[model samples]
Target: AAQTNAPWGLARISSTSPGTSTYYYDESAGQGSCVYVIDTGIEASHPEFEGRAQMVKTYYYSSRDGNGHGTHCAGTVGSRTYGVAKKTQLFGVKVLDDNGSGQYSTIIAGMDFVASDKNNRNCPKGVVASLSLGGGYSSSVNSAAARLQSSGVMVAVAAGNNNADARNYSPASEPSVCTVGASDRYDRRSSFSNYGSVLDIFGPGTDILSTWIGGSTRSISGTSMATPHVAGLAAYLMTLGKTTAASACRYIADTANKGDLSNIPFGTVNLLAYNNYQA
Candidate 1:
């Protein structure tokens, strides 16, 4: 049984142009890869995960996802239905609180956990981490992200929702991370998405539907939603042997669909994230 209709965001990535409304991906797209969702947390028992998702580390009080943001992000990365990579092992790293906010100290601790996990060989060779939260510039956060990448974890971060220059944001501005911006169904930059030369690529973000807590689903918009798509794609690439952070980032940018997006801000790259899943 193949899918006749797919999520707009998933469909958009597989097609060279818009309006396909159907996704195309290999059956084993993200096999042997692992993705870390660094956000509020995740409801690992959610049916969408099919036993593939779990909370690996938590800086917050409990392991449960009080806010659904992390679960939504995990779904976009590799849920059974709405994922970019259908089989990537999904791990939740709870950095943000139930209110979807956390101090830099906690965020850095989560990054260190992921890096140390990879260094300890606790993770597979193909590893990626999605950071869907950001704030004003923080050199410490930027350095932690850099260290994460240096430890062989491909990092994808949201470019912020300020609609201002992404270069002024923390992990988004960090050269070692793949800074992502939001694009809508029409291939237009979302009005609230931060942009600029700092962004590595754009992904379908506006009105994105994904898994939520309490075993439900929801649609939301922001660069937060966009970053996981890239993270999932990077995981897919890693399964294809793009094992290093730098290599995956270069491959993603080099292989992205270019010049299709509308309303791209000046200095922002016009490349859109593509999984190389041709129809």
Candidate 2:
């Protein structure tokens, strides 16, 4: 698997950073009010995630694995202690099976459920979806995503945990999607992360410690882990003040601590930038 020290990895032109988030939270609150993880089923009862997790939906349409990938990803997004989106609520979709693969159709179905928002409790009108699993972007999916987004829901997808440039699939390749890239603590892109202008921000996807099966915390890695870090930071932004989805996104993106390319290709993402963006 991929390895890095930064918690999350990044690409060359990479700029997103979690180190900046500490300051953001110190400066502002949290912006990512409510978001969801549309991947394998989340490990609902992990320790770091004691009384703050619930499942809105589970899609087992394609592959099913015994591995706790979804659970792991969920921990990254919302697991307590190690979780990034501490205050933000999270849900999971078991689209991928035990082995780490699933069908596109099933994913669409899960998105359908998220978009409907009738079942989602914490995220009533659909929250920001932190998708750790992704293929190339799809028009059909885009249409659906657009509908939800237009209505008020936003989806953040992983730029595939692979080390290619928008390679391997469709949705990750889509323009509309906020394709998340991975970054290590050093501020460099994870060697495994896919990069391109399509990739939005980076997060802690390196050696991350979060929820494991049986309510344990373990260290795993991937862009999956990173997505949730941003998710958590985003959620923290929400806690700073508002609870609206779009406003949360705006706050997250705008507040991103902008980094200078002095050393890194991309500047750092300062979630604290919101304070200055307004100034």
Candidate 3:
């Protein structure tokens, strides 16, 4: 029953833990969990968000998604219909511009918010951050990911779509965050996905379908698309009482379909969320 109600990525991880296949309708799917999309911003009024997404911060323009990239990623992370943690509170921390470009300082600032969440940016809940944005390696960005992780927030970053070694990128090589690469529906690497020892896991990304701006859904491809699937799973685990980043990552990696991507370095990897507590 749950498989029929979930998407390919979410269905693969759904094992009746934090939520069932109908996680979209399950109030506890992400009742106390949250995810922050630190990217191009989000369309606060998008129907798919169902009033759960908010523009919590903006470094450039207003938090409204001008480019739609962030909105799409947010949909994959927590949308009621297309996400892993259906009821999780989604926040947009705009670090990229309308053209999908951003400075390192802007990106790190967004990570700061994920680490602090002062005054309840997380509404008093911990966050699992998903950043689909990337650039060349930067110590600041790398440190920010580690800091957020140490603060108990699960940070999932894109391995980048450059097809180069992900170690050349910032947070992807940071070794602390959950660095994600892109895989097709068949669980193979997407041709454009950057891979290497640094990549932590792979997720559905090729031609992936999810919410867009203006109350629409679209299919796009990139490691960016894959990043949110892991973020959603992290938030789902958080809802199931896996609060620490270490524990959440452990459970996810332990249950993942390992040894599946030996051809691609570090490609072993999720509906894939399950609960160990059973009667």
Candidate 4:
């Protein structure tokens, strides 16, 4: 079914109001699109993935997720029960270690692989990368992200959770990436979400439930959780023919619902992500 009772984050993106309990989306929402989860790793065997998720590359020693962050983010992007684009293919690129920490060099290496792989395959429909981790500014990481975008991959990055201006962070501050902040069920900015002009949009992130390691589920909160929602929406837009990174980002920003969110800081865009699914 194209419409179903959905998690609040999913339902929120499909509606203009704050109280919707159902998510309405095209049956072919993410057909032929792929989303790369660039984080710790994803437990691809998690039942919620239904064989759609896999670890295609890894910077770590083992190709497994010891930390559940990446799996949870991937689930939000494409898992059947708690995803934005339920049909999107998921590729886990492990850059962060089990403790969810990585050096800029390692992270950039993963981004390089994604760029090369996407270029080689030449996916004409949609290709997206969800980066839910960030640190202080790094010229190398920012440059790599720009190169990835130039290669036709839509990149969505988390506005860091430090509750400060996002401009002080890498990837989030990089203009070429779609910097996503967090909102809650009440349509308010998340308490820990970084803000400012660097933010491109807001996505639901508080108390989000999604696939975890060990074939289970968990509810967590962070800008990390919010970014994949935007990434998945970008993939959905690609399925609708907004094929390139610029085109998908433009569509998302242009169609986003404005003035519905509260507690937005100065210089931050007042827009919340929307999927154009009206009931």
Top TM-score model: 4
TM-score of candidate 4 against the unseen true structure: 0.97
Could you give candidate 2's per-residue lDDT for residues 177-271 as a string of tens digits?
55566656565566777666565566656676667766666777787877766655555545545445555445555545555212223332322
Q: Quote model 3's TM-score.
A: 0.88
Error of 2 at 232 (Å): 1.9
lDDT of 3 by residue, 57-112 (tens): 99874777889899999999988778877788998899998999999988888898
The local distance difference test score of model 4 is: 0.90
Stretch of 10 with least lDDT, candidate 4: 117-126
**Candidates' lDDT values, in order?**
0.88, 0.57, 0.76, 0.90
Name the best candidate (by lDDT): 4
What TM-score, over all chains together, does every model reach?
Answer: 0.96, 0.75, 0.88, 0.97
The sequence of per-residue lDDT tens digits that candidate 1 reaches over residues 1-279 is 134577899888787988877888766678888899999998999988999888888875697999999999999999989888888888889999999999999999999999987654344547899999998999999999999988888899999999999879999999878999999999999999999998988998899999999999999999999999899889877776655666887788888999989989777899999877644
Q: By TM-score, how accurate is candidate 1?
A: 0.96
User: Candidate 2: where are CA atoms >4 Å away?
Assistant: 1-33, 61-65, 118-126, 242-244, 247-250, 260-279
Go through the candidates in order and give the C-alpha RMSD of each one to the true structure.
1.5, 6.2, 3.7, 1.3
Pitting candidate 1 against candidate 4, the one with the higher TM-score is 4
Backbone-clash count (model 1): 0
Q: Quote the positional error of residue 270 for candidate 4 in Å.
A: 0.5
